[PDB]
Structure 1
Amino acid sequence: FPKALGYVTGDMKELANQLKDKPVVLQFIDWILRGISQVVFVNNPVSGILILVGLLVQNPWWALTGWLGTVVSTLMALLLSQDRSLIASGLYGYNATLVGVLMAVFSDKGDYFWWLLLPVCAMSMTCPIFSSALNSVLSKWDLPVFTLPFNMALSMYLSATGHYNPFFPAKLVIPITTAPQISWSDLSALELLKSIPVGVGQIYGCDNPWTGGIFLGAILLSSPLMCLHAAIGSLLGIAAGLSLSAPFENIYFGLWGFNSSLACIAMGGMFMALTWQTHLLALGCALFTAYLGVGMANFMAEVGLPACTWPFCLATLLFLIMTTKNSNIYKMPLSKVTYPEENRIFYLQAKKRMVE
């Protein structure tokens, strides 16, 4: 356990290095699994395997379409001569992971609608394009693209099909038009506790509590700090939902937790170096993101769309673009971002250099 562990924590760069001479198919599978895990900012193929297992526990059909999307986007990125370092760390696959899974989730035709593999492929082939274009812009400000490629691809696909498409109908999204009757005496502490892993699970559209727990274990295996912040951000989404008197069903289903979870991971040591100041900033950002999440869900329902993780992308870019004159609130150079423990060591070293 102690020896074998260190080999599977972090971003497994030793395995990445040892694969560079191995048969190209093994390298490809490594890129697929890292693409899957990058949905939660993790660059680790063992975490990608565990996330696959969680997807399979939720619904093997969604596991299939998410895996298929990852493969097609990775192949497209190669056909289009994208940067190999980005491909090899999964950054040309994770948006198509979300595309495949959530196309399955929002289909109105149910499990194993095999025709769905056509649009799943089609939209997956657009993810590198979306990814390349956005990167070419945002990298000039040293910002990441997050899941903007996925959200653009999905809003476009779901607007194009809609509920009335004869071939690929989507689920009908209906805006609220009555105040939800709220009976606070039925509030269940056990179900709210359960909503924390579910909120993590909904990052991949999964409502099964066991799947959210498996996702948390995947993150934990890569990085304990990231896992802490995933859980905390899910929790903060729950608290926000209750602050706005949201129907308990939606909280229990994790709909208030996946955006704030993603924002809390990103801000809590990932793209900002972890100090007590940026920890509080990440809690603030998670809360803010939950409020933006419900606002965008309402707004998008007026046009028949889900919000998915538009809220996370917009909020987290906003917090990363804000400046301060506080030396302890430090944004990571993207070329130096790995995972919170390591980022913190970099920050402390650079600070000792600043103090010389």
Structure 2
Amino acid sequence: KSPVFQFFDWVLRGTSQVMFVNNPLSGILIILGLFIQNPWWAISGCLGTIMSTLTALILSQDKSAIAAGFHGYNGVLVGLLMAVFSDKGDYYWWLLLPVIIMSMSCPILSSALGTIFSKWDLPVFTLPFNITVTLYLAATGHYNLFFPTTLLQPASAMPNITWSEVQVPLLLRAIPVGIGQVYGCDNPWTGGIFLIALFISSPLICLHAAIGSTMGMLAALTIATPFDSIYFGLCGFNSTLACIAIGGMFYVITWQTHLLAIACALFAAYLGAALANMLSVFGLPPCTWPFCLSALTFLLLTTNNPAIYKLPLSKVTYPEANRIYYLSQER
């Protein structure tokens, strides 16, 4: 095996580890979906992942958690969110420069947070992306002269929501859109590609992703969010990530854990609305902060009943194998 082939296998695993799925075929499907959405964003995300995992190599990280894509998944998101929020337009080639620098900052953060979380056997999640992208989008802002960003400002008037005009078909379509919005992509076709890409590896992740996107869609219909965000998918990427993380991966899948995951989707969606109203004061977007906060507060949660079992971090692979491992360890 040529080492360059091994490295590209690593980057493909990284580009799908965002969905907690470690499978290069799902990675290539997700890359295809990104290119379907907008080739510029796909190029930016691939550059972000390449530089992130390369920096992980240079810093001489643990070689075990790079063949799992553990250091690339924070790069694809940095690239995609850097290039979806740039006001200069498409193929503004200069944007590739900070996308490099910030991509070199994901392993560092991913290391540091790890040492903070090691005391509680808790995963670093998508916090490294949040810190880096918040750093960039606040460092530059909308009025910057080299890398301006799209303007986000707090609501200043009561939204005009008419429940006569709700389109249920579009509202339903908010499920695959919510799945795809994790990567920044809103096209329903890329959402379908993502759902298929998850379903190839493990059905439970796909099921919990669909349930999470739906659950967030519903949670933002209770606090009367404007319908444009519902159709566009902005209210269903924190929810889906939280649902996947809590449902069957970090907890052995069980009906108790299933209800816990749905509750986590609720908490994550409401926290997403909160942080979106708060972080829009600075002009920042809610870039996968709510998922991180809700998943952390749902994994640190302590219970008595034996059904709610938190797998040791090393053992995690995917929900089916997690359940198989737990059943084996019971014997």
Q: Could you say which residue in structure 1 is the equivalent of 2:57? A: 78
> In the alignment, is residue 199 of structure 1 matched against residue 178 of structure 2?
yes
Is 1:279 the equivalent of 2:258? Answer: yes
Q: Does 1:219 align with 2:201?
A: no
- Which amino acid in 2 is paired with 1:24? P
2-side partners of 1:308 and 1:128: how far apart? Answer: 18
Give the drift of 1:348: 1.8
Deviations 1:144-192 (A, max 9, x none): 1111000000000011000111100111111101111111011111011
Pairing 1:1-356 to 2, within 5 Å after superposition? 22-352=1-331
Q: 2 CA distance for matches of 1:76 and 1:341?
A: 32
Q: Which runs of 5+ in 2 are unaligned?
A: none
CA distance in structure 1 between the partners assigned to 2:256 and 2:330 by the alignment? 15
Deviation string 1:92-134 (CA, Å, 9 cap, x unpaired) is 1110110000000010111100000000001000011111111
The structural deviation recorded for 1:341 is 0.5
1:310 Cα deviation after fit: 0.3
Aligned residue type for 1:86? A
Partner of 1:3: none
- How many angstroms apart in 2 are the aligned matches of 1:41 and 1:64? 22
Distance 2:288 2:162 in 1: 29
In structure 1, how many angstroms separate the alpha carbons of the residues matched to 2:158 and 2:250?
39
- Equivalents in 1 of 2:281, 2:55: separation in Å? 34
What CA distance in whole angstroms lies between the structure 1 residues aligned with 2:80 and 2:248?
28
CA distance in 2, matches of 1:136, 1:31: 23
Structure 1 unaligned blocks of 5 or more: 1-21
Over the matched positions of the two proteins, sequence identity in percent amounts to: 66
CA distance in 1, matches of 2:117, 2:9: 26
Provide TM-score, normalisation by structure 1: 0.92
User: Offset at 1:346?
Assistant: 1.2
AA of the residue aligned to 1:32: V
Q: Which amino acid aligns with 2:119?
A: K
Q: How far did residue 139 of structure 1 move?
A: 2.4
The offset of 1:258, in angstroms, is 0.5
Matches of 2:278 and 2:184, distance apart in 1: 20
CA deviation vs aligned residue, 1:285-304 (integer Å, no higher than 9, x gap): 01110000000000000111
Please give the secondary structure, in 2, of the residue aligned with 1:306. Answer: coil
Following superposition, the deviation at residue 349 of structure 1 comes to: 2.2
Count of aligned residue pairs for this structure pair: 331
1 CA distance for matches of 2:154 and 2:89? 22
Report the Cα distance in structure 1 between the residues aligned to 2:295 and 2:148, rounded to whole angstroms: 32
The C-alpha deviation readout for 1:232-275, integer Å capped at 9, x for no partner, is 00000110111111111100011111100000001111000001
Q: Distance in 1 between matches of 2:105 and 2:287?
A: 18
Return the letter of the residue paired with 1:331.
K
Q: Which whole-Å deviations, capped at 9, do the CAs of 1:65-84 have from their partners, x for residues lacking one?
A: 00001001111111110010
Deviation at 1:215, TM superposition (A): 0.5
TM-score (norm 2): 0.99
Provide the C-alpha distance between the structure 2 equivalents of 1:76 and 1:236, rounded to a whole number of angstroms: 37
Residue 23 of structure 1: how far off its partner (Å): 1.3
1:80 counterpart letter in structure 2: L
